[model samples]
Target: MNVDHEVNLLVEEIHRLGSKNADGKLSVKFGVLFRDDKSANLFEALVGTLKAAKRRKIVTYPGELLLQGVHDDVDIILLQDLEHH
Candidate 1:
């Protein structure tokens, strides 16, 4: 799918997953099955959405992406989780 469509789909998925859990946080790890170039664009778009939601400590580098935030009483942790369940 195109970048715009992909982004919307991802956002929708996040909201769905975020609310699915009753407690704790909503952790998301999206592994886009595409080339590096396409993945980069997808990541950038997703990052914008994350920042718009007031995410913090977002670290972006070559082949890496991260976003952390809390929205609608749900903590949105993207692509990185230090603790295990």
Candidate 2:
């Protein structure tokens, strides 16, 4: 079914755990994403999943590359819910 399986989980977690702005858009901090194994365990290749999600216009962040401490507070915005798709 097109191997977007990981991306599917990414979206779900973002919806489940990410914050909602006034616009009702969702987001999750970089630190919060890597905070623990709860969600991370589901991601065998977390970074790739994030990049591809961004590539597909599902999410956006400050930079392409993120370092632990430096980009910790960086917020990643979820662009599409796709429930309407």
Candidate 3:
């Protein structure tokens, strides 16, 4: 459940930093989370969980990959709560 747990946490942090935008969806810039102090330790691992989250539709961003300088500002949208009960 490593990926499951990590994705759950990643979503929570994204929700904390992101807010409902004009589209009425919670969103955050890709780099904002990547460079954050909270997720700093999970640097490499974040990509894995993010890819999974994207696949699962918990989050959405343009294209499939996020390049640092190239796609840093891409707004990742939160589609649903992974921790919802």
Candidate 4:
């Protein structure tokens, strides 16, 4: 399947499965679109997963990927729980 079709399927699955939080609160599922279309596609999903995995190493829950104000905006941890070298 193509990327578009695959993405659509993923969206449908997420909608059907739903989600929840620690306090049994219904977690709202969403998707963040990152457009680095100009750049080469080497680390698309890998980059985000790696970032989240690093956060998990420090027992960080509710992982976030920041793409924001800076030169060449990348993963900028807002409230850094712990810095990993």
User: What shift in Å separates residue 20 of candidate 2 from its native position after superposition?
Assistant: 1.0
Task: List pairs with backbone clashes in candidate 3.
Answer: none
Model 2 clash pairs? none
Q: Order the numbered candidates by TM-score, best leading.
A: 3, 2, 1, 4
The digit string of per-residue lDDT tens for model 1 on 1-85 reads 4554544444455544433234344544333212232545545465554544333332111223444322222344534333233
lDDT of each: 0.40, 0.78, 0.78, 0.33
Model 4 residue-pair collision total:
0
Clash count (model 2, backbone only): 0
Candidate 1 has an lDDT of 0.40
The better candidate by lDDT, 1 or 4, is 1
Candidate 2 regions with alpha-carbon error over 4 angstroms: 1-3, 38-40, 83-85
TM agreement with the true structure for every prediction: 0.29, 0.80, 0.81, 0.25
Question: Stretches of candidate 4 above 4 Å error?
Answer: 20-85
Estimate the overall C-alpha local distance difference test score of candidate 3.
0.78
Model 1 residue pairs with clashes: none
A best-first ranking of the candidates according to their lDDT comes to: 3, 2, 1, 4
